[PDB]
Amino acid sequence: MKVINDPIHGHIELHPLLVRIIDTPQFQRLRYIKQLGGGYYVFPGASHNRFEHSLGVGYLAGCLVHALGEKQPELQISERDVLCVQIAGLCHDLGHGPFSHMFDGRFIPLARPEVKWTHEQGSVMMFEHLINSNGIKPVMEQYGLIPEEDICFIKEQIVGPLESPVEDSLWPYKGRPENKSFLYEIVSNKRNGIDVDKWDYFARDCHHLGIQNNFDYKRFIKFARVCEVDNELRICARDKEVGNLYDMFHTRNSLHRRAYQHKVGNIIDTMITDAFLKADDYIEITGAGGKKYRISTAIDDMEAYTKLTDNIFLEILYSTDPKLKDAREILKQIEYRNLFKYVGETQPTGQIKIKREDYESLPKEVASAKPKVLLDVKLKAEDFIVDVINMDYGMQEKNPIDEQLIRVYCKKVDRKSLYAARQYFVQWCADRNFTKPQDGDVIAPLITPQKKEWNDST
Amino acid sequence: MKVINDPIHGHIELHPLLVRIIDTPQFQRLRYIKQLGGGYYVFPGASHNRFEHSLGVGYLAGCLVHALGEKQPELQISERDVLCVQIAGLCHDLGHGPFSHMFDGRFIPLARPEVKWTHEQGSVMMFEHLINSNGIKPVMEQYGLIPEEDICFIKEQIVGPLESPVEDSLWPYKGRPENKSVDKWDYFARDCHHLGIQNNFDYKRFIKFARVCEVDNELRICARDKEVGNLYDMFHTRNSLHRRAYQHKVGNIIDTMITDAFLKADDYIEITGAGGKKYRISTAIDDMEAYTKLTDNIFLEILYSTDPKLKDAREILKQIEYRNLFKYVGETQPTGQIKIKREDYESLPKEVASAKPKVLLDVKLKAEDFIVDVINQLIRVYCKKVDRKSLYAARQYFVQWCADRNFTKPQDGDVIAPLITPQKKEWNDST
Amino acid sequence: MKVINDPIHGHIELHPLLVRIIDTPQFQRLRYIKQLGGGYYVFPGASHNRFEHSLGVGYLAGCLVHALGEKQPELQISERDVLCVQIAGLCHDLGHGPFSHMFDGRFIPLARPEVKWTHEQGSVMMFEHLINSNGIKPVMEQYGLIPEEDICFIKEQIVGPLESPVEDSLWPYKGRPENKSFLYEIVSNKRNGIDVDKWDYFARDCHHLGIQNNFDYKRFIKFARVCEVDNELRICARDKEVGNLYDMFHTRNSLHRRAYQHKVGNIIDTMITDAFLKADDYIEITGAGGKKYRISTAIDDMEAYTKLTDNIFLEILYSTDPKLKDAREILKQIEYRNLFKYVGETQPTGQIKIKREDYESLPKEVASAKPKVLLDVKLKAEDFIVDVINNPIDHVSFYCKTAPNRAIRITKNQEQLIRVYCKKVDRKSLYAARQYFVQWCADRNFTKPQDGDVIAPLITPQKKEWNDST
Amino acid sequence: MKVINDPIHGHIELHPLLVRIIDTPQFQRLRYIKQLGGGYYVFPGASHNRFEHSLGVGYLAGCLVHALGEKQPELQISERDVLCVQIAGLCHDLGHGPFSHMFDGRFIPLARPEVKWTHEQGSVMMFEHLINSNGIKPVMEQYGLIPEEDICFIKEQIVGPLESPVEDSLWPYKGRPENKSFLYEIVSNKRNGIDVDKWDYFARDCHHLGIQNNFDYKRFIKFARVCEVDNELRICARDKEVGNLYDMFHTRNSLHRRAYQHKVGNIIDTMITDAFLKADDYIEITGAGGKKYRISTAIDDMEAYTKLTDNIFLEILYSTDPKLKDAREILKQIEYRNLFKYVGETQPTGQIKIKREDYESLPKEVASAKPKVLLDVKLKAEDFIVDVINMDYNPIDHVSFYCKTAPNRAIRITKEQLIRVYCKKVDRKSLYAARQYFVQWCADRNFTKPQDGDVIAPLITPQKKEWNDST
RNA sequence: CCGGCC
RNA sequence: CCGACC
Ligand SMILES: [Fe+3]
Ligand SMILES: [Fe+3]
């Protein structure tokens, strides 16, 4: 058992097995990839990496489990359950890619349109590989828990429903029973949204970025207890966390609308992702048997998944090879904060939402926009841009109870080039059937008038 | 007008010249080093970038200049003084080495013994290189600033001494006024905020409680007579932060391991810059081109290469692939006048490796397996070995070396040495 | 320019006129009036008086009006109205009598059923007496105020429209023209209940009772802004502080269900009220011109109401007079802690709510309630005591975004109790009182007791009027 | 086994005997005696009373004795001692008069200068009256106490040695044998100054005044063990809390510099004292047998002293008797804030001091000043007042040392009277004359020259050679 | 600055 | 479980 001090988490004490397994290099790659991701180009202070966020999530899940077992001993969950919860929370986001939010949102979504997968499956696979490489089976036996069940429980908590839930009204998870889901929801609240990881992320972002955290998660955990709803085990705020929970929801909205939904930071992230894509074949990491896998193709290789940090960006910034001139230009452009210029903002309408495969064609489709306007420079794939920041979850019914931001970036920063990019963005919005801009009366003095809808003020 | 959002000083007002300087390749690359260095391993919450600390210091300096100008109309504060303050607060540590203090305090001895230089020389060279590469001399001129004079004044404001005279022919201010007379407070506040260390002193109160006074017919900074509590709290916070950054057990181990990794891969790492030069990590300060490609990425890159030619070097990362840091024995304090100075910095590990204690020992280490690092007067004792017998042998050798150095007696020297500590009659005086 | 240090609001920096109003007999009388009333004999910590509460209320009213006036230079909030709101805050409780809400609550109605008296009317009367006796009016002239308007405005802020508001939907206040309709929302508010009085006494009660106060009025005051709702200027809050308002109302409910509705803090109040009643006819209090008023009629004169404070309690406890022997006796039964025992509680069904004018008639009906089974003890009329005791998205606006009169004010939010106490404490007496209480709760169309089935099995089915839960 | 909620100590559990003792008229008399006395008219939040103070002190004494008997079983602390220490903590202030320390600090020594009276004597007498009147002795016998010696023990804890020894006449206390000496330092220590009463009233004063209280008695009781010090078992603390103890003393100093010496709470206390002194001969209080006792003599009979609380203030304020007129007016000048002005402050030099018997003679000497200047104000004894604010009598002092692994060797112990003169008249020339008279009187009495003494000393200053000597 | 004294 | 129901 070892205790560490953090700005928000506080005490980092754990079990002897968890203490022994915490100081590992497999989860050190979390410390080498920023959880804030594009926040380095956004938040001057919030340079925290996935290690701090994951440790806070695990500690908060363990504290919640301890509080539930103390105030509600009817669960009869022994120390093995808490140890398994801590081991699972130690890998909350231990399967993402370089720059975190850029990989599963921009890099993985574009590198392999034919293979759509997010950080969840990658996290499960990476945690399984790390467990296999550690060889902590005798150590787990010294902890009193059988590995053949601890590994399954950790994987189920990390991923979720891993049994391909059929329409039958059985247990969706093959690890947890019909009356054993109370402990696994502390790591992530897939329905209520009150997750230890989410609260830790919100608090850390607010603290290291300069925002106000009015939530008191400790009181929520103290007053939560285990209750029965819809003939199932759950956790809810008893009577007096309505103000605290509403403040937490407002803070989450502020964080996800001011930091994860900014403008310049999204442009910087898009430029970084595009530069990595142009250099995908130029940074090959050694794999198993002496083989090599590209950073683009390493999402299915754990040798380079354990070797996928933001140092790839550093390699891109300090390439010692002569074949990376195309990526060197983008690296030099991003070195002096000379990234692209935003042409506006947009959001689609209706229930139709594009998949991961359509993201790759979205840049080409947005560049292919061509209204009846003569442009000095044609909006090509490398000249124009379609930045599609997908918004996971978000649409939660009765947030107290309980698509994608589109941006047009110009590779050229000339005034005439800016006007051409704005015209191309208007053409793309018309093609995608997007609503008129808020300042569209001036932003589109020659593109909006083409359609009679703009003139129909009534 | 550019605004930078940081939790140290909120928003920082930067004019077009200040914005261009802050938005520069060197300024952007300045955020690639750690203030706490290896202590980031020991303390997770402290991972701040150096560029943010420099920006906060510059904002504090600009605010102080504005307050001095507004409070005293007779001060006649023009744009030149504010521009010099901003340039200094920006390039105060512009070219700080890998992990800032770690490189310039550990890696210089193994870099090039012929020329000695702290982080100040590298900072001055990096600022000069940034000015040369930016090509914004007309931009600075259009703001009313003299380029050479401002650059020299900013460099002098840094630890580096502009002039040779100590106090006879003015001060080390060959381009500045010796009579004429902050960053430390801003850095301390940033470190306290990042590491979670409570700071009882507010930087704003100290900034607002400064005045220009005529002492010895010279302008000097004077504080309020009722601000002793703020001063004390500030000093306490600074000391606490310094101890946390330097005295960290894991930090210390990471430090020494970083230096070992840097030395081991001298013939397996290099850079490219002007003239197609291929210089190793030892020559990263003499040439500004080497400093341009400088980042803490080695702390991962040297740890991530998968080549057989560096397999043993890769094995250094293997020491991190199974977490086991060097054991801590103890420390002591200097006595008399004999101390391990910078000249003895490159010889102290060799002196430790050559020790022959007269005690029952079975495990010995060579120069490469023995590390002698001091905290500069306390010198800690860390043994890279993991065996209990090896640790005891290393402790006995360290005790013999300290007894031959006649240093201060340790806290529990009787337990560490049953006879070696008893050998000296001077150190056995319990009264 | 005094400043008063407070353990809740810190510094309460004042104005010379407020100091003149404060250092008077009629304001310092508040220094000996319990804020929680009888709650001191149930909560040892709640020893605070109305004096500091009134100081804090004046402070908070000044803070809110000053914040609104500095934020918005269009409302034309002058220093005159700021001072007038501060005066209304300080004088909002000048009319309290012995043991605060026990006096105009359970005492005066049970003593004088023919008079409608409230502490706000007493506040108006005491403030008029304070400005007349102490010669404040020349000072009010000095400091920019015009008494002929400002005094009426202060009285209206304390109690409401003095002049029997006319039927048409005109402006019912004769003090301020309607273009300052927001100013009548600072001190006392009935539309939504966001008034500085409630903030101050919630914080003070939580400080003195050990309860934990989560609401933070400073955040509200910062967000507080005047917005236009239903063509009238009102004070609203930023949409962020909605959770803070939830906390405030949670604190309100806690203070009500733990402090102000205490099971035994009301028994003690009943005993004190009975002691005052028995001593009402033998405690002469002098008025203006030597006219001796009693406890109950002292509300008809402000020279005799000024001399009427909590000391009356002890003035009956220390009596050597034989005429007070009964009343003093009751007070003694409290020092020994020999209080009346609880019997049961009930709630009113529908809208037929018992009023204060019927309070003096309440026990007799309980006396007329005799259970349909044998009773060992036949409790007389005075042998039982029947004591009566009186959402977040109310008419409260919520400033939407960066727009002055945005007025996002819907949010769609997305009676009384009766307690029976027994003078006798025998087991058979307890059973008889429980049976009589069950009979009363089963025949007066009132809700059945919480534990009525265990309190009395032969007085449950009395009538069908009080046996329907629909 | 009831429990009382306190804003300071949270839940306070009480033995049935403690409740029986609490629910008596003599104990409930404390509800109507303010803790800070005249500080209310200065600190609006400081309206708390002695009743909750006594409750909390009993709580703390019980907690400390229980801890000390749980850690070390060789001390052999039994339930009898626990109940006796708790009772002593409860009744340690049963004898407080109106406005607390003002009664035995300013009123009684000035109303009856020939009578010695401390509130500990009144506490002992009131406790005896409580026990006798309320039939507590049968209940004390029932639960385990033996009144003949247990009551003597409680009285000794309240006041000290019930008899008169000289220097070394063996063990003074007849309550408990010497091998339980520590039991006499819980409720009221006189050597170390660490007693469970000061903890509670420091916490309560800081709660109601808004001052910050960094001390934590829980972390003291947690690490307290009894150790031998000069062949006397004493309660001792871990050295790891010694710095914490510093905080407590720091808090103490704050409370004695802001609250108890406010220079406006003292002039208000003086005005209340003068009003009481003038209404003394006419206010009647009935005692046992109907014998009317005045306010001053009421201390001699506990039945009359039970009915003597802060209410007397209001009883003089709300009166209509012509004989009380003057007294009543001095209470009304307080209600207009038309208080008397402080002419000056000084301190005694060396070891010269004013006792409780010379307080009455002090104003006459103050009025007896004869400055060698043209003083147009003929100030008499009624035109001046002299308040001797006796400061109550160290971070180490009788320090304690519960050093780890050393449960026997406690060797780790390593680390006045103000006089304020006020003037009844309010004329500016009268104020200057009063300042000059105060300076002259302080010079004549060899007292320390005031810091602002020379401000109103343009004529008689050259007369005094020592006054001009700055060294 | 007689309910303020960082 | 009459100064408790945190
Ligand atoms: Fe009220
Ligand atoms: Fe006491």
CB B47 within 8 A of CB B151: no
Q: Pairing mode, if any, of strands D233-237 and D285-286?
A: unpaired
Q: Of A423, A431, A326, A345, nearest to A384 (Cα)?
A: A423
Please give the single-letter amino acid code of residue C437. F
Compute the Cα dihedral for C314, C316, C317, C320 and give only its sign: positive
D352 and D251 together in one domain: no
Residues 6+ apart with CB under 8 A from B179: B217, B218, B219
CB D440 within 8 A of CB D460: yes
Is B5 a member of any domain?
A: no
Is D210 a member of any domain?
A: yes
Residues 6+ apart with CB under 8 A from B168: none
Q: How far apart are CA B377 and CA B340, in angstroms?
A: 9
Experimentally, the structure was elucidated by cryo-EM
Residues 6+ apart with CB under 8 A from C436: C343, C366, C369, C370, C371, C375, C379, C384, C420, C459
Q: Which two tokens stand for residue A205?
A: 């972002």
Is C90 a member of any domain?
A: no
CB < 8 Å to C321, chain D: none
Please give the single-letter amino acid code of residue C421. Y
C211 touches strand F (CB under 7 A): no
Residues 6+ apart with CB under 8 A from D27: D21, D51, D54, D90, D91, D94, D130
Q: Of A299, A271, A291, nearest to A114 (Cα)?
A: A299
Q: Of A142, A103, A137, nearest to A120 (Cα)?
A: A103
User: Where does residue A446 rank: exposed (0-12), middle (13-18), buried (19+ CB within 10 A)?
Assistant: middle
Could you say which of D204, D227, D262 is where a domain stops?
A: D262
Report resolution (Å) to 1 decimal. 3.0
Q: How far apart are CA C353 and CA C445, in angstroms?
A: 11
Q: Of A124, A97, A125, A121, nearest to A111 (Cα)?
A: A97
B303 and B353 together in one domain: no
CB of C44 within 8 Å of any CB in chain D? yes
Compute the Cα dihedral for B333, B336, B341, B343 and give only its sign: negative
CB of C242 within 8 Å of any CB in chain A? yes
Is A2 a member of any domain?
A: no
| A with B: touching (≥3 Cβ pairs within 8 Å) | yes
CATH of residue C350's domain is 3.30.70.2760
Q: How far apart are CA B157 and CA B149, in angstroms?
A: 12
Q: Pairing mode, if any, of strands D417-423 and C292-293?
A: unpaired
Q: How far apart are CA A355 and CA A116, in angstroms?
A: 9
Q: Give the three-class secondary structure for A146.
A: coil
CB < 8 Å to A335, chain B: 25, 28-29
Compute the Cα dihedral for C112, C118, C124, C126 and give only its sign: positive
B239 and B297 together in one domain: no
A205 and A95 together in one domain: yes
Q: How far apart are CA A303 and CA D316, in angstroms?
A: 92
Q: Of A330, A347, A326, A311, nearest to A433 (Cα)?
A: A347
CB B154 within 8 A of CB B91: yes
Q: How far apart are CA D240 and CA D221, in angstroms?
A: 13
Task: Calculate the alpha carbon distances from C310 to C307, C328, D314, D315 in Å.
Answer: 10, 15, 10, 11
Is B429 a member of any domain?
A: no
- What domain range is A33 assigned to? 16-258
Q: Tokens 């020389």 label which residue?
A: B121
Task: Calculate the alpha carbon distances from A285 to A34, A311, B60 in Å.
Answer: 20, 12, 44
B242 and B255 together in one domain: no
Half-sphere exposure of residue C201: CA atoms within 13 angstroms, side-chain side: 22
CATH of residue A209's domain is 1.10.3210.10
- Give the start-end residues of each E strand in D260-367: 285-286, 292-293, 341-346
Is B4 a member of any domain?
A: no
Give the residue whose CA sits closest to F4 at C1'. Answer: D3
Total length of chain D: 471
Number of Cβ atoms within 10 Å of the Cβ of C298: 23
B241 and B298 together in one domain: no
CA-only gyration radius of chain B, Å:
24
Residues 6+ apart with CB under 8 A from A122: A95, A96, A97, A104, A108, A299, A305
Chain C residue whose CA is closest to D26: C335
Q: Which two tokens stand for residue A295?
A: 């950073």
Q: Of C99, C76, C217, C83, nearest to C153 (Cα)?
A: C83
Task: Calculate the alpha carbon distances from D229 to D166, D186, D234 in Å.
Answer: 22, 16, 7
Q: How far apart are CA A186 and CA B97, in angstroms?
A: 43
List, as own/partner pairs, every contact residues C192-198 make where C-beta atoms lie below 8 angstroms and the sequence separation is at least 24, other chains included: C192/C394, C192/C395, C192/C396, C193/C394, C194/C220, C194/C235, C194/C237, C194/C245, C194/C396, C196/C57, C196/C60, C196/C61, C196/C63, C196/C64, C196/C89, C197/C57, C197/C60, C197/C89, C197/C92, C198/C252
Is B146 a member of any domain?
A: yes
What DSSP letter does each residue of B52-118 carry, written as one string?
Answer: HHHHHHHHHHHHHHHHHHHH-GGG---HHHHHHHHHHHHGGGTT--TTTHHIIIIIHHHH-TTS---
Q: Of A83, A88, A69, A90, nearest to A144 (Cα)?
A: A83
Distance between first and last Cα of chain C: 61
Q: How far apart are CA A13 and CA A5, in angstroms?
A: 9
Q: How far apart are CA B37 and CA C142, in angstroms?
A: 68
CB B37 within 8 A of CB A77: no
B244 and B375 together in one domain: no
- Strand nucleotide closest to residue D343 (CA to C1'): E2
Q: How far apart are CA D6 and CA C208, in angstroms?
A: 9
**Which residues lie near ion ligand 1 (Cβ < 5 Å)?**
C 201
Q: Which two tokens stand for residue C307?
A: 């001399």
Distance of alpha carbon B422 from the chain centroid: 38
Q: How far apart are CA A125 and CA A118, in angstroms?
A: 12
Task: Calculate the alpha carbon distances from A227 to A72, A175, A184, A240, D86 in Å.
Answer: 10, 21, 14, 16, 43
Q: How far apart are CA A300 and CA A456, in angstroms?
A: 52
Note the ligand closest to the C-alpha atom of D94. Answer: 2
Q: How far apart are CA C113 and CA C360, in angstroms?
A: 7
- Asked if B5 and A40 come within 8 Å (Cβ–Cβ), the reply is no
Q: How far apart are CA C305 and CA C123, in angstroms?
A: 11
The DSSP code for A408 is: -
What DSSP letter does each residue of B341-370 carry, written as one string?
Answer: -STTTTTHHHHHHT---SS-------STT-
Q: Is B359 annotated as a binding residue?
A: no
- Domains in chain C, number: 1
Could you say which of B223, B249, B275 is where a domain stops?
A: B249
Q: How far apart are CA C62 and CA B94, in angstroms?
A: 51
Q: How far apart are CA C132 and CA C153, in angstroms?
A: 16
Q: How far apart are CA C57 and CA C452, in angstroms?
A: 43
Q: How far apart are CA A109 and CA A102, in angstroms?
A: 9
Q: How far apart are CA C206 and CA D157, in angstroms?
A: 36
Q: Which two tokens stand for residue D170?
A: 């063996």
CB D141 within 8 A of CB D69: no
Task: Calculate the alpha carbon distances from B116 to B108, B120, B402 in Å.
Answer: 7, 11, 27
Q: How many angstroms does the Cα of residue C92 sit away from the middle of ligand 1?
A: 8
Structural element, H or E, at residue D303? helix D302-306
| C with D: touching (≥3 Cβ pairs within 8 Å) | yes
Dihedral angle computed from the Cα positions of residues D417, D418, D424 and D425, in that order, rounded to the nearest 10 degrees: 150
Beta bridge partner(s), residue D418: D389
Residues 6+ apart with CB under 8 A from A123: A91, A93, A94, A95, A96, A158, A159
Q: How far apart are CA B409 and CA B423, in angstroms?
A: 12
According to the 3-state scheme, what is the secondary structure of chain C?
Answer: CCCCEECCCEECCCCHHHHHHHCCHHHHHHHHCECCHHHHHCCCCCCCEHHHHHHHHHHHHHHHHHHHHHHCCCCCCCHHHHHHHHHHHHCCCCCCCCCHHHHHHHHHHHHCCCCCCCHHHHHHHHHHHHHHHCCHHHHHHHCCCCHHHHHHHHHHHHHCCCCCCCCCCCCCCCCCCHHHHHHHHCCCCCCCCCCHHHHHHHHHHHHHHCCCCCCCHHHHHHHCEEEEECCEEEEEEEHHHHHHHHHHHHHHHHHHHHHHCCHHHHHHHHHHHHHHHHCCCCCCEECHHHCEECCCHHHHCHHHHCCCCCHHHHHHHCCCCHHHHHHHHHHHHHHCCCCCEEEEEECCCCCCCCCHHHHHHHHHHHHHCCCCCCCCCCCCCCCEEEEEECCCCCCCCEECCCCCCCCECCHHHCCCEEEEEECCCCHHHHHHHHHHHHHHHCCCCCCCCCCHHHHCCCCCCCCCCCCCCC
B262 and B385 together in one domain: no
Q: How far apart are CA A292 and CA A300, in angstroms?
A: 12
Q: Tokens 């039964």 label which residue?
A: C333
Number of Cβ atoms within 10 Å of the Cβ of C260: 17
Q: Of A289, A344, A282, nearest to A313 (Cα)?
A: A282
Q: Of C119, C87, C100, C10, nearest to C48 (Cα)?
A: C100
Residues 6+ apart with CB under 8 A from A396: A193, A402
Chain D 21-60 residues in 7 Å CB range of strand F: 22-23, 28
Our CA-based measurement puts residue A447 at a distance from the nearest CA of chain B, in whole angstroms, of: 31
Please give the single-letter amino acid code of residue B108. I
Return phi, psi of residue B330, to 5°. 170, -155
Note the ligand closest to the C-alpha atom of C35. Answer: 1
- For A254-291, b/e burial (b = at least 16 CB within 10 A) is bbeeebbebeebbbbbbbbbbbbbbbbebbbbbbeeee
Q: Which of left, alpha, beta for D302 (phi over 0: left; psi -120 to 50: alpha)? A: alpha
A233 and A375 together in one domain: no
What DSSP letter does each residue of D226-271 carry, written as one string?
Answer: EEESSSSEEEEE-GGGHHHHHHHHHHHHHIIIIITT-SSHHHHHHH
Residues 6+ apart with CB under 8 A from B98: B33, B107, B284, B294, B295, B296, B298, B299
Q: How far apart are CA C47 and CA D47, in angstroms?
A: 6
Q: Give the three-class secondary structure for D25.
A: helix
Task: Calculate the alpha carbon distances from D290 to A62, C144, C316, C319, D293 in Å.
Answer: 72, 60, 18, 13, 9
Q: How far apart are CA C334 and CA D23, in angstroms?
A: 9
B271 and B365 together in one domain: no
Could you say which of B302, B321, B340 is where a domain stops?
A: B321
A32 and A148 together in one domain: yes
The DSSP code for A56 is: H
Q: How far apart are CA D259 and CA D202, in angstroms?
A: 11
Q: Which two tokens stand for residue A91?
A: 């890998």
Q: Of C155, C147, C223, nearest to C184 (Cα)?
A: C155
Q: Tokens 């009427």 label which residue?
A: C308
- Asked if A40 and B31 come within 8 Å (Cβ–Cβ), the reply is yes
Distance between first and last Cα of chain D: 65
- Strand nucleotide closest to residue D258 (CA to C1'): E5
CB C425 within 8 A of CB C342: no
Residues 6+ apart with CB under 8 A from B342: B109, B116
CB A183 within 8 A of CB A77: yes
CB D120 within 8 A of CB D95: yes
Our CA-based measurement puts residue A399 at a distance from the nearest CA of chain C, in whole angstroms, of: 10
Number of Cβ atoms within 10 Å of the Cβ of B121: 20
CB of B299 within 8 Å of any CB in chain A? no
Q: Tokens 């003949």 label which residue?
A: D148
Beta-sheet strand order (sheet of C384-389): C341-346, C417-422, C384-389
Q: How far apart are CA D113 and CA D123, in angstroms?
A: 21
Q: Is B327 annotated as a binding residue?
A: yes
Q: Pairing mode, if any, of strands C384-389 and C417-422?
A: antiparallel
Q: How far apart are CA B279 and CA B272, in angstroms?
A: 7
Q: Which two tokens stand for residue C108?
A: 């005066």
Residues 6+ apart with CB under 8 A from B147: B131, B137, B140, B141
Q: Which two tokens stand for residue C74?
A: 């269009």
Q: How far apart are CA B314 and CA B342, in angstroms?
A: 30
Q: How far apart are CA B87 and CA B62, in angstroms?
A: 10
Q: Give the three-class secondary structure for D48.
A: coil
Nearest to B6 among A12, A44, A48 (CB): A44
CB A426 within 8 A of CB A453: no
Contacting A residues, span 387-446, partner chain C, CB-CB under 8 Å: 398, 400
Q: Tokens 């467990």 label which residue?
A: A131
Is D236 a member of any domain?
A: yes
Q: How far apart are CA A335 and CA B19, in angstroms?
A: 15
CB < 8 Å to D32, chain C: 314
CB C418 within 8 A of CB C359: no
What DSSP letter does each residue of A320-365 carry, written as one string?
Answer: -SSS-HHHHHHHHHHHTT---EE---B---SS----HHHHHHHHHH
Q: How far apart are CA D399 and CA D165, in angstroms?
A: 25
Return phi, psi of residue D343, to 5°. -70, -40
B81 and B178 together in one domain: yes
Q: Give the three-class secondary structure for B6.
A: strand
Q: How far apart are CA C24 and CA D445, in angstroms?
A: 40
Nearest to B28 among A25, A208, A336 (CB): A336
Site from C314, C321, C324, C333 to mutate, D interface, most D CB atoms within 10 angstroms: C314
Number of Cβ atoms within 10 Å of the Cβ of C355: 9
Q: Of D440, D302, D430, nearest to D373 (Cα)?
A: D440
Q: Give the three-class secondary structure for B236.
A: helix
Q: How far apart are CA D61 and CA D184, in angstroms?
A: 11
CB B316 within 8 A of CB B258: no
